């Protein structure tokens, strides 16, 4: 069977981990995968998470199966983060959430759901976007098209090109939108633009699909949900996949959700039964630990208070880091002006380097970034900032 099998090409993001382990040069700077690092260059487990785990340890009595859609309390809590306390969606019982294995698992289930229960044939992904998007939808059997988004020249959102290219999207097509902190550009639509996209969407007949992986990293929990919420108030149906890997620092515990929204409760229930069937045929039920931790935190006011301050701290460290990055670059006499970095939201720096420049960075300096020229700013520490900038200047 396996005699003619070809070696699959390494993942453009995850492949960096393998490369790094083989490179024994001490001063390696990892700016690849989008995980948070503290001032010491370590990705630690939040204090709020440790405390919740303590609670679980002491009060957990069984590890019996969770139910296809997972921990009920967890779904309720995620809905409020996304839609808001007194959301009409929540109150009209138009939403159903399923706990999934990370944000990727959520995208996979929505894709399987779509592929087999609707007439959806294609999904529109921004150009550029997280690489795994195309892969997830294509493996489900869906065709993936791309719409204009970034403006490499001005480093902004080319709204006109976005709209003009999306006019090719027919009714019944899925249009994938990043809730906030657009991976990898860091450029998000203004609230005004979100409303325009919302009205255009309903008018054209698109099925919105939001990918929320960084809620809380742009401006704050609620502020970051404005885009989705503008879409929620006008749409009958929509799908939203979120992750808790980044904002809770629970990467390996695989915590995320897939939410379905329909015109009413009976439609959403009928649809949700098919989503559960797609899950039963994948992993059966989701992993409890990570979601249990998230439910425990959000549900307890004290733990929630500590968690929110931790999220605020992380965001604040990244914002200060990108400013310090641009400042140090000028001191090293960097060729180009990278001030646009400060306008980007999230953990990434994008639009400054070329593929060959990043290749030379790892080759000659041991600095690891994604081939598209995307650097994890959250991986920059006061200690490595200097030798890193020196590496960049020598490559410009």
Ligand X SMILES: *Cc1c(COP(=O)(O)O)cnc(C)c1O
Query: Which residue from 304, 318, 303, 298 is spatially nearest to 375, judged by alpha carbons?
Result: 318
User: Using the rule CB under 6 A, is 224 a contact of ligand X?
Assistant: no
Which stretch of DSSP H or E encloses residue 317?
A: helix 301-331
CB of 41 to ligand X, least distance (A): 20
307 is in an annotated binding site: no
User: Using the rule CB under 8 A, is 45 a contact of a copy of itself?
Assistant: yes
CB of 243 to ligand GUA, least distance (A): 9
Q: Give yes or no for a contact between 154 and 135, defined as CB atoms under 8 angstroms apart.
A: no
Beta carbons within 8 Å of 262's beta carbon, 6+ residues apart: 94, 236, 237, 268, 271
Which stretch of DSSP H or E encloses residue 355?
A: helix 355-365
Q: Considering the complex, state which of residue 5 and residue 333 has its C-beta at the smaller distance from a copy of itself.
A: 5
With CB under 8 A as the contact rule, the residue among 31, 68, 144, 391 that binds a copy of itself is 68
Q: The tokens 């897939």 sit on which residue?
A: 258
With CB under 8 A as the contact rule, the residue among 233, 281, 305, 394 that binds a copy of itself is 281
CB of 186 to ligand X, least distance (A): 11
d(CA 82, CA 237): 15
Q: How far apart are the first and last CA of the chain?
A: 49
Specify whether 130 is catalytic. Answer: yes
Specify whether 332 is catalytic. Answer: no
Task: Give the interface segment with ligand X, choosing from 100-108, 227-235, 290-298, 381-389 (CB under 6 A).
Answer: 100-108
d(CA 301, CA 65): 27
Query: Taking CB within 5 to 8 Å according to partner kind, which of a copy of itself, ligand GUA, ligand X, none is near residue 273?
Result: a copy of itself
Give the pairing of strands 95-101 and 255-261.
antiparallel
Catalytic position from the list 30, 69, 188, 211: 211
Catalytic position from the list 130, 194, 206, 307: 130
With CB under 8 A as the contact rule, the residue among 216, 286, 351, 366 that binds a copy of itself is 286
Cα 168 to Cα 124, 146, 204: the distances in Å are 10, 10, 10
Beta carbons within 8 Å of 192's beta carbon, 6+ residues apart: none
Query: Taking CB within 5 to 8 Å according to partner kind, which of a copy of itself, ligand X, ligand GUA, none is near residue 72?
Result: none
Q: Which residues, 180 to 199, sit near ligand X by CB under 6 A? A: 183
Q: Give yes or no for a contact between 352 and 389, defined as CB atoms under 8 angstroms apart.
A: no
Give me the residues that bind ligand GUA (CB under 6 A), please: 13, 33-34, 130, 183, 284
Q: Considering the complex, state which of residue 264 and residue 356 has its C-beta at the smaller distance from a copy of itself.
A: 264
374 is in an annotated binding site: yes
Q: Strand, coil or helix: what is 354? A: coil
Task: Provide the token pair at 249.
Answer: 């620092």
Specify whether 124 is catalytic. Answer: no
Q: Give yes or no for a contact between 113 and 275, defined as CB atoms under 8 angstroms apart.
A: yes
Sign of CA dihedral 176, 180, 184, 189: positive
Q: Considering the complex, state which of residue 156 and residue 285 has its C-beta at the smaller distance from a copy of itself.
A: 285
Task: Give the interface segment with a copy of itself, choosing from 187-195, 225-233, 258-266, 300-308 (CB under 8 A).
Answer: 258-266
Site string for a copy of itself, 215-254 (x = CB under 8 A): ----------------------x-----------xxxxxx
Q: Give yes or no for a contact between 125 and 306, defined as CB atoms under 8 angstroms apart.
A: no
Catalytic position from the list 51, 112, 173, 246: 246
CB of 115 to ligand X, least distance (A): 19
DSSP letter assigned to residue 251: G
Q: Considering the complex, state which of residue 120 and residue 391 has its C-beta at the smaller distance from a copy of itself.
A: 120
360 is in an annotated binding site: no
The set of catalytic residues is: 130, 211, 246
- Binding-site annotation, residues for L-aspartate: 34, 130, 183, 374
């Amino acid at each position: 069977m396996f005699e003619n099998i070809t070696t699959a090409p390494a993942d453009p993001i995850l492949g960096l981990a393998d490369l790094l382990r083989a490179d024994e040069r001490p001063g390696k700077i990892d700016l690849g995968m989008g995980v948070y690092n503290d001032e010491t260059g370590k990705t630690p487990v939040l204090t709020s998470v440790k405390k919740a785990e303590q609670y679980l340890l002491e009060n957990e009595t069984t590890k019996n199966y969770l139910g296809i859609d997972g921990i009920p309390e967890f779904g309720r809590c995620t809905q409020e983060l996304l839609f808001g306390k007194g959301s009409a969606l929540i109150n009209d019982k138009r939403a159903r959430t399923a706990q999934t294995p990370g944000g990727t698992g959520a995208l996979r289930v929505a894709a399987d759901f779509l592929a087999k229960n609707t007439s959806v044939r294609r999904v529109w992904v921004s150009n550029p976007s997280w690489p795994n998007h195309k892969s997830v939808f294509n493996s489900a059997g869906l065709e993936v098209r791309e719409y204009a988004y970034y403006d490499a020249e001005n480093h902004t959102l080319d709204f006109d090109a976005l709209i003009n290219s999306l006019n090719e999207a027919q009714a019944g097509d899925v249009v994938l939108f990043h809730g906030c902190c657009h991976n990898p550009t860091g450029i998000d639509p203004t609230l005004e633009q979100w409303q325009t996209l919302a009205q255009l969407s309903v008018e054209k007949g698109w099925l919105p699909l939001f990918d929320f992986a960084y809620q809380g990293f742009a401006r704050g929990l609620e502020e970051d949900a404005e885009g989705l919420r503008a879409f929620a108030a006008m749409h009958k149906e929509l799908i939203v996949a979120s992750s808790y890997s980044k904002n809770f620092g629970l990467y390996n515990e695989r915590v995320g959700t897939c939410t379905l929204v329909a015109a009413d409760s009976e439609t959403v229930d009928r649809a949700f039964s098919q989503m559960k069937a797609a899950i039963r045929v994948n992993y059966s039920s989701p992993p409890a630990h990570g979601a249990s931790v998230v439910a425990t935190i959000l549900g307890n006011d004290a733990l929630r208070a500590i968690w929110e301050q931790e999220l605020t701290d992380m965001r604040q460290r990244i914002q200060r880091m990108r400013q310090l990055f641009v400042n140090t670059l000028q001191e090293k006499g960097a060729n180009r002006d990278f001030s646009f970095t400060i306008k980007q939201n999230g953990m990434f720096f994008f639009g400054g380097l070329t593929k060959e420049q990043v290749l030379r960075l790892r080759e000659e300096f041991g600095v690891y970034a994604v081939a598209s020229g995307r650097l994890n700013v959250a991986g920059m520490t006061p200690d490595n900032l200097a030798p890193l900038c020196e590496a960049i200047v020598a490559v410009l």
